[PDB]
Amino acid sequence: SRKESYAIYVYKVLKQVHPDTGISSKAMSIMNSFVNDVFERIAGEASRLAHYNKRSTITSREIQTAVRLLLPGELAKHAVSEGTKAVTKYTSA
Amino acid sequence: SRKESYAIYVYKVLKQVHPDTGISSKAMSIMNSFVNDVFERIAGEASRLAHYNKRSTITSREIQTAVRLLLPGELAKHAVSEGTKAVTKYTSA
Amino acid sequence: GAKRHRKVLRDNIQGITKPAIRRLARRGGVKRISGLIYEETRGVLKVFLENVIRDAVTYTEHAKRKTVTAMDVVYALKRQGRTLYGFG
Amino acid sequence: RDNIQGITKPAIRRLARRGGVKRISGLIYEETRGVLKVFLENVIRDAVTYTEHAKRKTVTAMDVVYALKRQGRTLYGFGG
Amino acid sequence: KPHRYRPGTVALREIRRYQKSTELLIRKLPFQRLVREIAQDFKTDLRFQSSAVMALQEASEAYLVALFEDTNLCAIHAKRVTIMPKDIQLARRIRGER
Amino acid sequence: RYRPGTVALREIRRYQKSTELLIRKLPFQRLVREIAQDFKTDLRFQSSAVMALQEASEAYLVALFEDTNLCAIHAKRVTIMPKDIQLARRIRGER
Amino acid sequence: DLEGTTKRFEHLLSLSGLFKHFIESKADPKFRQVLDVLEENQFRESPAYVNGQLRPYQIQGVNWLVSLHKNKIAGILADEMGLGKTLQTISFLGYLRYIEKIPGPFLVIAPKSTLNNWLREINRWTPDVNAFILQGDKEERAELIQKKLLGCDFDVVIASYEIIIREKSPLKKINWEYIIIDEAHRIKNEESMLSQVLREFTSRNRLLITGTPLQNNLHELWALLNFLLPDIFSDAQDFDDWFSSESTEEDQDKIVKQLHTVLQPFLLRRIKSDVETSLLPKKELNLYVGMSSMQKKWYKKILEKDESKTRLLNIMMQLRKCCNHPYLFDGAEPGPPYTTDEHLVYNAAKLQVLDKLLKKLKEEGSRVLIFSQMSRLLDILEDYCYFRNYEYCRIDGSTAHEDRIQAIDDYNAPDSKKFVFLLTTRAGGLGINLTSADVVVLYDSDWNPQADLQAMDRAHRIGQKKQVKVFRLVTDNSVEEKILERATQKLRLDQLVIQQNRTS
Amino acid sequence: AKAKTRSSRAGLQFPVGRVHRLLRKGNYAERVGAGAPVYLAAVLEYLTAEILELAGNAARDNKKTRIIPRHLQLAVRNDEELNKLLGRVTIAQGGVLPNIQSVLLPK
Amino acid sequence: AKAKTRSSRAGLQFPVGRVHRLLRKGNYAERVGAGAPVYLAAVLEYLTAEILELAGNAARDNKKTRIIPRHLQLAVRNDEELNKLLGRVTIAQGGVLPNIQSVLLPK
DNA sequence: TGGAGAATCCCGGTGCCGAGGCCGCTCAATTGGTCGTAGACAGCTCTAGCACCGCTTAAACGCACGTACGCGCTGTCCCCCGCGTTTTAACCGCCAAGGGGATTACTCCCTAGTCTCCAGGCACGTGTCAGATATATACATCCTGA
DNA sequence: TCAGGATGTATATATCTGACACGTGCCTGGAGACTAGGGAGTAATCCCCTTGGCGGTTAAAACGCGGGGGACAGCGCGTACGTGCGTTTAAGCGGTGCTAGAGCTGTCTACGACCAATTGAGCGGCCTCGGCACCGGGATTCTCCA
Ligand SMILES: Nc1ncnc2c1ncn2[C@@H]1O[C@H](COP(=O)(O)OP(=O)(O)O)[C@@H](O)[C@H]1O
Ligand code: BEF
Ligand SMILES: [Mg+2]
């Protein structure tokens, strides 16, 4: 059966960052696990926020708040900046 | 505005166990918090069990497994016994 | 004169006095206490409170409120893995 | 059947060296064997609970990963 | 001659007293001022509930009591009876809070 | 001959530089099967399942030994001891 | 009891049938049983047991009070302050002491600065009365309760506001004759613990006294009134909606006559202007001064939130501090040694005109009094008095029991060179007499204008041999202007009906 | 017919209907079985009765007749299963178990 | 017309559509907004890029051209914020940071 | 091997305030239908787990030997505890005054559901080169003796 | 203090190979389009609740000081732990053999969602007295110095 992951996207990001560096299979699996784990943490926190405020819709504002709760210190500012930039560009075009 | 809790039910259980002992208000608030917390723990564990097995229903089998995963030792054994007793009585009657 | 400026030295963290810290240690079961424990304890408490209050304020500000509530504090604690019973 | 003794003395010394222990007592070995047995008991009991719930008869790597995650030790690299 | 107790007797008596009681051990106004001052660095002009401040104080005192128990264990481990900042730091370092 | 405490430091550097496992595969596997024998009979393990158990166990023990070392230093020693292990686990709350 | 109820109705029903209407507007115990049967069917000589002379209106007030006593009905001595109402009370207690020959248990309540005055005047006039100032810590109150209060070795006892709250249980055991309540301003609230504990004591009569009548509302009015005759009213919103708040909707202004005629024999209020007793009025000036140029910058920093990184949770109070004085905001005084010089007066808006006025009044011989809300502002004023080296005495909240007395005496000592006298507002000006002073100045405005009036008339009483020159300070183009506007609003919301009370 | 509550049918005291509603609206899965609320209510009742029994004994052990947070704390921290369960939980106004270390005491 | 993927029009590399699907099929809420997946995908891409550049630097310092779990471990444990984030995480075939206490080293 | 002083417990009386019982009503829980799909169950394939044997060799083991370190003991001195006395700020009542959080009513636009279609992503080959492996030389570093 | 021997470790270079980077082919899941309706947003109103100051009491913190006992440093000694070496032992790798059971597909039915009507269990409001927390005296027990 067809099983999916984030391998191709992680590889594209790698070729954007270090243009001539490869990555082994075990490391690739590790980073797949990392992306899944972070995704699930953020989504769970956003879900709990939305239920907390008796709303029934996860929006970019709940995602932003969950990011600010989970990520530590200087990481949070850059993360929210990247998210805001992406959403702004998406809506503008 | 209506606000619902477990006061009356905790009180009925108390009157079954210790027929004459009372209970204060802060103690009742603590018991309410305890019941809510255990509810949430069991329900979340059962939810992730159902998701792991690619099911879409929370059944008594999921609840039983979640109890067995959360409660320690004798608590798990007697809780399983009580839950099974209640389900058997519910179906047979 | 020159008395209107004789008391400007609160420094709120000093509000956690030496006797209070000693009482806390006694409840913890400590029989004898060094003299440097007080400043160290004040630092530890300040860090703990900063973390909890940051989380509670984030929850509150998300909810478009201006009043930190007992529920917000409870959820901050629970998010730090310190569940608190007795406040709803 | 005395399988815990299969965790030999040199293996424990290697683990201690990786942890940074320069000089090791002699009673450490039984203590560490007991600690390891307790840890394994907890993790395997949770893993077998997941396996039995899934109505399988084979303990998969995912069951171990889930059990570790439940106890609070997330493990990266064995699938998802 | 004045009647003085041997050092440690009053310490043990206080230990029994405070492990018997349950009231809060920090003065409420100083604690509230501290909380408000700390909050001032995150969002200007907040407004706490009394129950919120009480919850903060409960949690803080429970945390400090547990930390002092661990500190006592470390101090005993070093064959002392006097708790020291290195004992506190070891307790937090093992807990994973440093 | 090397003076005591030299080969030990050399081994410290070597094993902190390395990455592989440190326990023999088959002894660990027999131990795992024996332990699981007490929960349900006639289980059956995937090789990756057993490997995951080994990775987790070794990581756990290494971290525990770092904490034990800290306690031993705290008592002004260089020799870890059972009571050092017990103190470390009690502080972590595994007791 | 019920016989007393019938006796009371003998005089209440002797007024309009409005008491009957109130009984019949209840939505009812057996008071109707004694009502139905009735429905279907002196000493004007200034008696000499006092040591002094009684004024004519004083004798009239004593006669009104003894009429209330004979009717066994209550009332309120709402006579304007400083009209010898202490003398009225002392002569009335002498009346109960001698004419009825009943010196018994009596209870009087006064503010802390004023516990001295009652004992001094009772000693000056009727030294035959056993009176205490029940002060001291727990133990000083302990032997006082144990020895004399338990020994029943007294006639009257003088206490403060809070001490009765502290000693309710050893005082409930003593059934009283009078619970004398000076400056009855704490009663305006029903949930006030003082009211909560004064519905508990049982005296044969309950003589409420005041310096000024109600402050804001018919609500306030019945809040005071309920504790006069409670078994008669025992009702909460009936009294309000029965009168409909000065015809709040139709603005008839004629139904006020019902209330006013009910209260006219049921209250006794006189004005200083009618019966002078001093033959000299008081002047009033509002010294509108500009808000200081230097603190203009910080006032902008407060308005636009510009110094920074500080709390502003009560913009009212923050702006009010700024309008009072700049240096209260913890840092306007840059000097690490905290210089004390003409820079303070230069930087504070009011103090320049204040220094001019002080130089004027020192030469003019005016003996001045200053009131304020901020004890810290009084600290700054104390430092500035040190700068100018004037003699004075500083009474503030929480000074002492004896030190209040000694400072008052030092100021009021004859030929006292104490030119100024620093004082707070809500702790200082509640009943003391300072006729040795003549001019009263307010540093700030207060959201209780009736309290302000209470304040200015400290020196404007019987014994004032000079013209009272009032100089209130109001900052121009400041929120204090709106303070004054709302103050005038609340003055007129009450004073029109107060003036209608006397006329009809 | 005649209404008879599911809690009564199961022979419980906790509200099966309320628990079923809470499982429904909690977004735990897409569907909820019919025996899940009964099982969960039985488990919650068992745990509640267990702690109440222990705390009642603790309260009677101090010659009291009303349960207070101190009594709850004593019961929980003295029973080892419940101590393991509520290992991360702080009970407000609960206090601490009396315990002085071995070497601190006078010899 | 001709489609243009949401990832492309947001300027990302991670799949916005896949994240949208996972959010919807994950029982996190009844409804899912339209900017939630874009935001979440951008954040995930940021974190991935961060770890990747640190691991690439480590591998280059080790004179290798491929990234391995050892390099991931070194990057994560040498960056303090990432270490705080992944505090309860074990990386298979990771190893430990080289570290010896001062008192153990010879004098 | 002791009484004397301080701490603590025993017992009864008192005031209070919150736990516990009663009551109206409303909204959530139950009862009874219809309908659609999740999953229970059968049957098939073929992967991957279990079992055993043979052979190589690297690690584990048992023992010898020496010294470094743990641990007990002693003395010293400094710093914490205990207690008496003075000062300070906590604590509760009180007074205002706004503001913010909840409620209620209405509206609209943003998300789920449905359908169509095609290209992005996944499974499957394939070559090749980065790393693993094996040797050889260079150098750092430890250790005993001078 | 240093010298020279000895041992382990890094640095250099030549050779395999199997794990990764890349190309093909296909199919399924994401994008485009369109509709309905309900959740979220906005306005207006209100009323409780948070804040800041003071007033006055009083309990707790602050402060000073003697002294004693515990932290700490040094010293000796004796044994338990580290280092090395030869012998044994079992891990690791390979290979062959077999089958349980994991994973998938297909059918169909029974169970859960949803809706509408009904009713009664639980919630807020209201009253009342008994459990509990002092408060004082007296009695007992503990600690400490003889
Ligand atoms: N009839 C009088 N004869 C002499 N002096 C009087 C008389 N009435 C009042 N005074 C003086 O006027 C002052 C007013 O004091 P007091 O009676 O306490 O006024 P109040 O009771 O209104 O405060 C007193 O100090 C008193 O000396
Ligand atoms: F006239 Be009284 F002193 F207020
Ligand atoms: Mg008078």
Tab-separated table of C-alpha atoms in Angstrom, chain F residues 1 3 41 48 52 61-62 74-76 81 89:
chain	number	residue	atom	x	y	z
F	1	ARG	CA	51.761	-0.269	33.282
F	3	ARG	CA	48.478	4.290	36.535
F	41	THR	CA	2.330	-16.201	26.878
F	48	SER	CA	12.796	-3.547	15.025
F	52	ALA	CA	13.800	-0.054	19.806
F	61	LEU	CA	20.878	3.884	31.633
F	62	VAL	CA	23.377	6.382	30.239
F	74	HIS	CA	28.420	15.938	45.391
F	75	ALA	CA	29.437	13.677	48.256
F	76	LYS	CA	33.122	14.452	47.525
F	81	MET	CA	27.745	3.757	44.601
F	89	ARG	CA	16.182	7.966	41.150
